[PDB]
Design a protein around this nucleic acid. Structure first.
Lengths: 127, 83, 53, 269, 60, 69, 153, 21, 490, 37, 84
RNA sequence: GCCAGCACCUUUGCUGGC
RNA sequence: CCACGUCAACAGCAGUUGGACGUGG
RNA sequence: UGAAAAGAACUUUGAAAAGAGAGUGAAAAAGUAC
RNA sequence: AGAACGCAGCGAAAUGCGAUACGUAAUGUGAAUUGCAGAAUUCCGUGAAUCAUCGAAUCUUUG
């Protein structure tokens, strides 16, 4: 995850900086999921922050091989709902199923005109 | 310029809508700093009226209720259909 | 009668009495229950459903 | 034409020549009581701790104005009411509040170093790395024989490159001793991780060189390895935990630099 | 045509223009409910007519 | 032109904006209360607080002009 | 989670009912539980119906604390009858659930025997009783959570 | 209260009456 | 009686007349279907004649009246010549009094809600007795007599017409499905449609209009296709000849059916937000045609009832010859110099121009006036429907709105305000485009269920919508297996 | 006792009584609630 | 009908105490239960007036009661217990 | 405003006394 | 307080009842 | 409590509370101060 | 410095702001925000943040 070193917090304090500090565009960092090898070559990157129209497959877990569009992902909870399965009850009470972004690999992209422009150009640390 | 809006919102309730029927009486809720003159002026420029009595009293909602009697010729039925 | 705590009070109030004197008909006790207004007990008094001692 | 004289060993290497004598500072009787005493002296200076706070004490005004009913005042403490308090809280006799000294700091401990004691400590440490059979006892494995403790080239400074780290480590063999470190026992430590306790991995070897450091950027990192100098070294690097007989690797020019001192301290047995 | 009825028929033609012109599976549903609705038809007026002709046979 | 914030609104001068604002306050004084309805609406929330967002604009321009004088 | 607790039955020869967090005695329903018994659902039911009319109480083995000098019965193995109809209602409301979960079972019809019954501390309601000089003593209105299970014999 | 069989009987005896006469 | 009393109620004659009182027991589900097809099997016997023998012999009653037939729910020359006509009429009268607000009633009180219902069924039987004295002053029966068997004939129709208002009630008390008003309208189509199109051909002659050549579908298609047991051949497509094309009447049951079953499929879509989620959800359509269904029944009924300008009540004053305040200035119903004789010039331009041939394009003026009138009457009863209870615009919008905010518990928002933009401006015009589409289907042709078919196959597709939704979303044999159900939330 | 008069002091504690918390439960589902009141 | 005199010289002079009356109403209830061979006994407000007219102390001793039957049977038992 | 009678299902109308 | 709706807790048992609970005025 | 609320559908019984069986999940003597 | 009472689409708990009342601005960013029921705004460039600004326009009442 985070790269050593400057802040020397052992510490459950460091864990809480992931949990509660830094919404959407430093949950860019924590909702990033690694590209394949076809599309690593294509854009020259390595990983890409998730889109809601990206199709993404689960690699780790107990639900470790399913594809599907991302129905929702939450900035606070940093957890990806995949569409779907789900797992129904018979009257239509229907359920999320949430996952972790770094336990996924993104297969097909929906990347935009100047979405990739900002990401590709240097990075940063310009907020 | 330190003027304020008076009417925060008009009160509508079971007793409030009864007043409209009785003698063309709308009933409002106005600021805690509200004054008789500014209630008279406000309803003039938002409903086109002549006010025939302003009297005000406190409500436990905190905002001060304002009892506003209005003209016979006003017709409070079809402009209480506006609001 | 059931839950006519309110219709003892209201029936008494409109005839201006202490709540002892006011009488509620046993036969048409259901029709006294269905009132719940101060003009709906004007009707009942005039019929003789509610009377005053 | 032979005295403590050593044959040079290189990382190329596949040695071809000879080296300067082994130090006479590698001679002196190995003594484990001194080794342990020096080790605990240095870490006490650094250590401090934290615990319960509120104040330490004392929210909570009193002078001992307990009110008798039964069994007593109790014995202690007064103020007061539907809390908290009793005692309390102000204890001890605590079911919620502080202990009997909230961790105190305060508490002057330490060991102040003396000039003579410090240079005795270093001399004994350098004569505790001259063994061989306490390497296995500590818990690290050396396949290679003989040439112990090991000697390496001057080219150790230059790296830099990651793949030349692997090239160095095969020669000193070792190698699988540093694959021990990165493998479970490594695991996860609990609340004892914070101050180091810890659970449960074992150390790898030490490397030492004379001029430098060297310690360069990429001699930092490599698993279980540590890097030191003959000018500055200590018993946390020559025996972490004070269970003497660390696997230590050296590099030529160590002898000449170490030997000349003034100073004033030399071997006796 | 004043302000009131032009306003009235402005939203009265968004009413009539939400289409969704009939797809071929809605068409199938119309066909089978006017197939059921043509055989409900098909036994009722048939029954009446068959026994109507015997009335004029029996009574001249 | 179409809308209502935030590049039309900011640079607008200003008698025009004031006239519009109080007639977007007659949308919400025809729709208060209740007439709320039950609402939210995100229109009502935005226009309630676009009275807020642009009376800060109106009082900012007056404030800054007095410091340029 | 809970029950049997005497595990053997087995569930194809069982019916079950449980109360849960009702405000009827702990002390006097352990005695009713020990004494139901045992006896079919019908025998237990009709005993507790006749209890309401005139037939005590149900024998008290161990909670037999004085009381006056007592009494008449019955008085089989006991001599200290009371008459709490509070605990009667609780066990009747347990039995009706157990006899309407023993009506789709479908098993039937002789069989029975109340295999196990156990009562739990739901807890104690904590209330107070006034006495003297601003000092105040404990008062409990006793509640219970109960479990009932039966087996074919 | 009459019944739904009284209405049923009425009509089928009425239809009978008309054909008969 | 008289005495000296203050009364104006006609109480003592009321139990001296054998009126009706109605059930009592009801049974679902296999005894709803059994007893509501039993109801339609007592109606089915329209094959039976009506007693009266000087009018069933030589004249055999005058030519069938194809204008009344589609909305009455009737068949001429039988026990049920009036059908629902006075029952719906007592609905028109009291929709008019209540909705005009000459009499004002608030229908959310139990006492005056069921006062309305009782008053309607009393006035249906009062309207029955005057309808059967209207129908012997029409001159329909081919004879006019002094009081003898002209008194008996009117008794019979009322005595089997208090039966057809019993059928309406029995089904409505839960011993059948739907309403018995809807059912008898949708077996008028059953009687009329397959008599017309499947039929059977027979050989007899008659100068007057008779049913000898009928059964258009068999006549047309089997002569086109090949030959049958009957020796036929050749194609008959279109003619203006006396002999019917057969193609004409086959096309114009289909033509209307496509476009009036699709007007209900034009719907007003209403968003919600949501059922479980935050975001877009149901498209929630409301029926276009079924809201206006009882509005356009009122509208179409009145075009056969007005003294000033309608069919039944002007055919009386054409037949009756004293000329005073009432005269045949209302309209002239007589034989014409025209080849086809239907009223030469009446004030009934509210009359449909259609017959069981093709439409009329020869008078555009009577077409415009007809369309204009029924749109005006189609918005007249639209706002009387709104005024008189149901899911009132004021009451329902107000109720959920202040029920939701403070409750329980509590809760917040509904879509009610944002769909009070959509619904009441779609309700009035939803019975103005329904009265427009009934006439434009009639323009193509078709008679004797001209506007009966339109509300009967779109009353049969209204029926389809309800049952399919119940099957596939509420439970039964279902289609929820494909994709369901409600996801979102956490 | 006396204060700075006044009817106004009574009015703003009348509002406070109404504004009191009390009560609901739909947010105790979605938290992290640690029982209170 | 039948007519009986319930003897209220028996036990209804030895009671008091203070509470003769609510016990007394109950005693009449289960005397009329035995005599008539019935379950429910109606206990009219005529009887209630007759035993609280003199009020507790405060009974008129033996009282006459008129009583009827019963054959209904258990479904909606009829025992008039006033004057039939 | 209160009380009484008659008409009226009520909402009301009429008459007399205070 | 007043009106309407309820019995989980609270009322010294109990409850179809409440000054309780909950929401309007 | 759990990786994820998947915080237990549906059916029978009970005045209700609740219980029976059943559903979910790796584990329900992990069923909610868990 | 500190405090009262308000504000809300909701208001349990926390602090976010002042009758304009968790508002928004100026840098700046990229597909998810409005805690959720619920009502809707955005998604091949103007929705959305304290990720970073001892930085801002508005600013009741008490001190």
């Amino acid at each position: 995850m985070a790269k050593q070193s400057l802040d020397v917090s052992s510490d459950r304090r460091k864990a809480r900086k992931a949990y509660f500090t830094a919404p959407s565009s430093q949950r860019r960092v924590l909702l990033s999921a690694p590209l394949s090898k076809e599309l690593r070559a294509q854009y020259g990157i390595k990983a890409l922050p998730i889109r809601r129209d990206d199709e993404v497959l689960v690699v780790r877990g107990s639900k470790k091989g399913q594809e599907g569009k991302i129905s929702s992902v939450y900035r606070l909870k940093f957890a990806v709902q995949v569409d779907k399965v789900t797992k129904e009850k018979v009257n239509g009470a229907s359920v999320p199923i949430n996952l972790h972004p770094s336990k996924l690999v993104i297969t097909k992209l929906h990347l935009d005109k100047d979405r990739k422009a900002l990401i590709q150009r240097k990075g940063g640390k310009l907020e | 310029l330190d003027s304020y809006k008076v009417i925060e919102q008009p009160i509508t309730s079971e007793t409030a809508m009864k007043k409209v029927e009785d003698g063309n009486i709308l009933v409002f809720q106005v600021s805690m700093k509200a004054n008789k003159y500014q209630i008279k002026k406000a309803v003039k420029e938002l409903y086109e009226v002549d006010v025939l009595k302003v009297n005000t009293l406190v409500r436990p909602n905190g905002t001060k209720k304002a009892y506003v009697r209005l003209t016979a010729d006003y017709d409070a039925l079809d402009i209480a259909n506006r609001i | 009668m059931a839950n006519l705590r309110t219709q003892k009070r209201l029936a008494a109030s409109v005839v201006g009495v202490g709540k002892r004197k006011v009488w509620l008909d046993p036969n048409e006790t259901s029709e006294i229950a269905q009132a719940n207004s101060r003009n709906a007990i004007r009707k009942l008094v005039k019929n003789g459903t509610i009377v005053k001692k | 034409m032979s005295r403590p004289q050593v044959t040079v060993h290189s990382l190329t290497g596949e040695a071809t020549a000879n080296a300067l004598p082994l130090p006479a500072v590698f001679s002196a009787p190995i003594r484990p009581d001194i080794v342990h005493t020096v080790f605990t002296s240095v870490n006490k200076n650094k250590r401090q701790a934290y615990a319960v706070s509120e104040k330490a004490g004392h929210q909570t005004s009193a002078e001992s104005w307990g009110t008798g009913r039964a069994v007593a005042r109790i014995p202690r403490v007064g103020g007061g009411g539907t809390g908290r308090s009793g005692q309390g809280a102000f204890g001890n006799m605590c079911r919620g509040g502080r202990m009997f000294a909230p961790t105190k700091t305060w508490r002057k401990w330490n060991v102040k170093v003396n000039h003579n004691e410090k240079r005795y400590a270093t001399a004994s440490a350098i004569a505790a790395t001259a063994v061989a059979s306490l390497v296995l006892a500590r818990g690290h494995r050396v396949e290679k024989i003989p040439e112990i403790p090991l000697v390496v080239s001057t080219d150790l400074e230059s790296i830099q490159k990651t793949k030349e780290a692997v090239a160095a480590l095969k020669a000193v063999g070792a190698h699988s001793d540093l694959l021990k470190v990165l493998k479970s026992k490594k695991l996860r430590a609990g609340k004892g991780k914070y101050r180091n306790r810890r659970w449960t991995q074992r150390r790898g070897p030490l490397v030492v060189y004379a001029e430098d450091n060297g310690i360069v950027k990429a001699l930092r990192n490599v698993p279980g390895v540590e890097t030191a100098n003959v000018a500055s070294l200590n018993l946390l690097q020559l025996a972490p935990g004070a269970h003497l007989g660390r696997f230590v690797i050296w590099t030529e020019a160590a002898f000449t630099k170490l030997d000349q001192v003034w100073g004033s301290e030399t071997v006796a047995s | 045509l004043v302000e009131a009825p032009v306003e009235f028929v402005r939203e009265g033609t968004q009413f009539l223009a939400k289409c969704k012109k009939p797809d071929l599976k809605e068409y199938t549903k119309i066909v089978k409910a006017v197939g059921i609705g043509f055989i409900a038809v098909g036994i009722i007026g048939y029954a009446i007519k068959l026994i109507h002709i015997p009335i004029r046979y029996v009574i001249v | 032109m179409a809308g209502v914030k935030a590049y039309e609104l900011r640079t607008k001068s200003k008698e025009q904006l004031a006239s519009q604002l109080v007639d977007l306050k007659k949308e919400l004084a025809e729709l208060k209360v209740q007439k709320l309805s039950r609402p939210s609406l995100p229109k009502i929330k935005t226009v309630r607080k676009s009275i807020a967002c642009v009376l800060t604009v109106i009082n900012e321009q007056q404030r800054e002009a007095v410091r340029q004088l | 989670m809970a029950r049997y607790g005497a595990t053997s039955t087995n569930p194809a020869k069982s019916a079950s009912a449980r109360g849960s967090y009702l405000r009827v005695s702990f002390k006097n329903t352990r005695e009713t539980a020990q004494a139901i018994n045992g006896w079919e659902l019908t025998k237990a039911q009709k005993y507790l119906e006749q209890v309401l009319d005139h037939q005590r109480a149900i024998p008290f083995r161990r909670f037999n604390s004085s009381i006056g000098r007592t009494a008449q019965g019955k008085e089989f193995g006991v001599t200290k009858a009371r008459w709490p109809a509070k605990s009667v209602k609780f066990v009747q409301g347990l039995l009706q659930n157990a006899a309407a979960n023993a009506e789709a079972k479908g098993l039937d019809a002789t069989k029975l025997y109340v295999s196990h019954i156990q009562v739990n501390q739901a807890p104690k309601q904590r209330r107070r009783t006034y006495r003297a000089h601003g000092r105040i003593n404990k008062y409990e209105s006793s509640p219970s959570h109960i479990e009932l299970v039966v087996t074919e014999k | 209260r009459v019944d739904s069989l009284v209405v049923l009987f009425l009509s089928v005896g009425f239809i009978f009456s008309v054909i008969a006469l | 009686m008289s005495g000296f009393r203050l009364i104006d109620i006609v109480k003592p004659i009321l139990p001296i007349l054998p009126e009706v009182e109605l059930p009592f027991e009801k049974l679902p589900f296999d005894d709803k279907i059994v007893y509501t097809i039993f109801a339609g099997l007592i109606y089915l016997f329209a094959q039976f004649p009506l007693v009266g023998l000087p009018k069933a012999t030589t004249p055999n009653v005058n030519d069938p009246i194809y204008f009344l037939r589609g909305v009455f729910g009737c068949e001429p020359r039988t026990l049920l010549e009036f059908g629902l006509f006075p029952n719906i009429s007592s609905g028109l009268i009291l929709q008019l009094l209540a909705g005009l607000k000459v009499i004002k009633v608030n229908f959310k009180i139990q006492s005056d809600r069921e006062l309305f219902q009782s008053l309607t069924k009393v006035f249906a039987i009062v309207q029955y007795v005057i309808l059967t004295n209207i129908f012997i002053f029409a001159g329909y029966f081919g004879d006019d007599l002094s009081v003898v068997q002209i008194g008996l004939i009117n008794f019979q129709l009322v005595g089997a017409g208090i039966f057809t208002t019993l059928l309406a009630e029995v089904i409505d008390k839960g011993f059948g499905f739907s309403s018995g008003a809807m059912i008898i309208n949708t077996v008028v189509i059953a009687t009329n449609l397959v008599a017309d199109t499947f039929g059977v051909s027979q050989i007899k002659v008659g100068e007057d209009d008779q049913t000898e050549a009928q059964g258009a579908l068999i006549n047309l298609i089997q002569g086109l296709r090949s030959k049958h047991k009957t020796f036929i051949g050749g194609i008959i497509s279109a003619f203006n000849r006396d002999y019917l094309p057969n193609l004409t009447t086959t096309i114009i049951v289909l033509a209307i059916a496509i476009i009036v079953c699709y007007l209900q499929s034009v719907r007003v879509e209403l968003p919600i937000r949501s059922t479980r989620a935050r975001g877009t959800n149901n498209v929630y359509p409301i029926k276009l045609l079924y809201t206006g269904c009882l509005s356009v029944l009122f509208s179409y009924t009145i075009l056969f009832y007005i003294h000033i300008f309608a069919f039944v009540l002007i055919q009386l004053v054409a037949k009756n010859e004293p000329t005073h305040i009432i005269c045949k200035i209302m309209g002239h119903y007589e034989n014409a110099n025209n080849l086809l004789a239907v009223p030469t010039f009446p004030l009934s331009l509210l009359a449909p121009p259609t017959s069981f041939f093709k439409g009329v394009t020869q008078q555009p003026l009577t077409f415009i006036t007809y369309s204009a009138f029924i749109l005006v009457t189609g918005i007249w009863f639209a706002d009387k429907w709104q005024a008189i209870s149901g899911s009132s615009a004021r009451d329902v919008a107000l109720e959920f709105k202040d029920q939701g905010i403070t409750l329980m518990g509590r809760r917040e928002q509904n879509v009610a305000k944002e769909l009070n933009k959509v619904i009441p401006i779609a309700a009035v015009t939803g019975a103005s485009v329904l009265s427009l589409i009934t006439v434009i289907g009639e323009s193509l042709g078709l008679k004797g269920k001209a506007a009966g078919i339109v509300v009967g196959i779109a009353g049969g597709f209204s029926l389809l919508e309800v049952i399919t939704i119940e099957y596939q979303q509420s439970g039964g044999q279902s289609a929820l297996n494909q994709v369901l159900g409600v996801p979102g939330a956490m | 006792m006396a204060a700075q008069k006044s009817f106004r002091i009574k009015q703003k504690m009348a509002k406070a009584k109404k504004q009191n918390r009390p009560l609901p439960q739909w947010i105790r589902l979605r938290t992290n609630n640690t029982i209170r009141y | 009908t039948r007519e009986y005199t319930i003897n209220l010289h028996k036990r209804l002079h030895g009671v008091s105490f203070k509470k003769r009356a609510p016990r007394a109403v109950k005693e009449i209830k289960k005397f009329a239960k035995l005599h008539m061979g019935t379950d429910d006994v109606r206990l009219a407000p005529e009887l209630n007036q007759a035993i609280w007219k003199r009020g507790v102390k405060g009974v008129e001793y033996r009282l006459r009661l008129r009583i009827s039957r019963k054959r209904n049977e258990e479904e909606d038992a009829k025992n008039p217990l006033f004057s039939y």
